[PDB]
Amino acid sequence: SNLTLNFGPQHPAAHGVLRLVMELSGEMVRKCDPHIGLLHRGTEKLIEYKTYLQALPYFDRLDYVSMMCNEQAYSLAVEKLLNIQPPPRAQWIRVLFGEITRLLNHIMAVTTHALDIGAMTPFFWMFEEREKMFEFYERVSGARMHAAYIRPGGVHQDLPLGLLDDIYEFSKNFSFRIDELEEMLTNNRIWRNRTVDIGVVTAEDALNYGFSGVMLRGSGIQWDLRKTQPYDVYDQVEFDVPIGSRGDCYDRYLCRVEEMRQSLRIISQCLNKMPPGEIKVDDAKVSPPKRAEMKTSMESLIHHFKLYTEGYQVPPGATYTAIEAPKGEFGVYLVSDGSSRPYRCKIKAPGFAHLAGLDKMSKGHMLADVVAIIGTQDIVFGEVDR
Amino acid sequence: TYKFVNMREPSMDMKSVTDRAAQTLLWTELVRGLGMTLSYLFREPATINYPFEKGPLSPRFRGEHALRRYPSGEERCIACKLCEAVCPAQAITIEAEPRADGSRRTTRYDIDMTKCIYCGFCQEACPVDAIVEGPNFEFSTETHEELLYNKEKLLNNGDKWEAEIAANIQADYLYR
Amino acid sequence: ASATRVIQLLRNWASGRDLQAKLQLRYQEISKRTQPPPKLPVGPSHKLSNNYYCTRDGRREAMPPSIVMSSQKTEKKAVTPAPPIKRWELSKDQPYL
């Protein structure tokens, strides 16, 4: 008879809300059974009672480590259903802040993974960079993480004067912080002993289990939605896709570090190529008019009133829109019945399938190995439970 | 376009093999990590001396709500209920009637700050800059009830913070 | 940075890098907290003529999906959902880490 253990929810490596029922023989893990729903808040049903604008902030709170990326996925779905196009400067701002968001997420993932493993120091070094990044969020929107900045039609406000220079100043120094983190972890023999050949997954199994993102690219699969199915202006920036060879924790960590470096590259290109112009679509039946126009012209006041009370009607139809979020493929299946409120909104989170693969990935490992594999899957339960 | 992260090979000459053996027996990379932590030890820390020092914030920062006035002292709010309609959390409750002088004014304006998500949609929707999210963020309480703001509380907040609120609006309104 | 020169040298040797070049803490280099007012241009639809909304109405150009092969109602070469994806090319910038 195996011993049965509750790993979480009140556990340091369980991320607060995950209860993992583990069957063990000694410390060998005979079976993993994740129990979730401890953070199920009924987001998908709540959205059915909101307008599209009212539903937008719910996406900030799904993957609360990558807010603007969720906003962008939802905005792209709604813009596809509306048959409208965001203005170019809005698309460049979207890509820039998406890469800043990827930096935030990869910092959180790598440092918390290292903290589970036992290396506590890099968390403190990198969370000051996260703090500086938070200021960029707050300066653009007034909120440190739940910005609600990216909306269908573009962005809510234009960048304040002086933001680009400060982003450039941060970006010209972040590479040295990456170098220090890699000096602490990459060649360390304890870190390699804790990560090499742990949670090895084959390419075929990764595809069949619904994996996406690094969980694919660590196993050698050459796939990135920004390259294969680009959105906004991602087909105008140069970057490389890091590819692993072993499908284990160490290769996935290396991939995430290199993705941070490539995000720095993309951010540099975005900073140098930002064009002038308007920042939301020039269509007042979708995007609200400027406040000066609202207080001067009758049509602007009417459209402000209607967009903020009823909201825009979306033509009937259904779309599955996916992006390369920092944690993998993040998707929305959005069904519009023609009214101003969405009929159905199914949210596809990469962590759902990734955590469903945890029992397969943990076969033949110990307790500490399972801690490492949980860290390597990059799970946030806001998106898992929704 | 892609790159490999873990596809390198070690040279098998006696120099490289002996260097690897010396690293194995004398723990050179562990000493490198120790040197990195020692270097960080002599750097100046990033800690600020709160509450004597504060974190930087933008004029766009969303804080505690307030209800504003015209320079004559008249309330800006005219009970259009656009903030109530747009509020994603249904945190706003408004009741209105004609005033004694016939003006369109609220009799009830409640914000449940434990329902509020501080998104700032109410202040975007307001046509007369009546409801705002101010700069204050230090308003923790000892009871739940104190966070259910009525109209008197919000008017007091506006009267108390208007000097800062007006300056922040003057700084940001050309972007809105 | 107010660190003395010997401590600076010790930090550089321990880290193996020139730490003063890229300091994490930020000083005077960052942008001023007071900025001049912006002007914020307007979009392509801000015109006084040749600007009828029915010529720029994206929502009204959406239509129900095309029906192929309802059930109620040769050569025939085989097809794929799209042309096969072209194989990725190795990076010129840095092929190997």
């Binding site: 450039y168 010209k172 470096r261 720095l264 140098n272 | 260097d19 | 002007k39 241009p41």
Partner: peptide
Amino acid sequence: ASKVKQDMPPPGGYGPIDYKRNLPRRGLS
């Protein structure tokens, strides 16, 4: 009647930004 004023990159673009790995050898034989 002033010029359009927006947050934009300085003429000639921004200075080059480093991203590649930098782990010096830094050791004896």
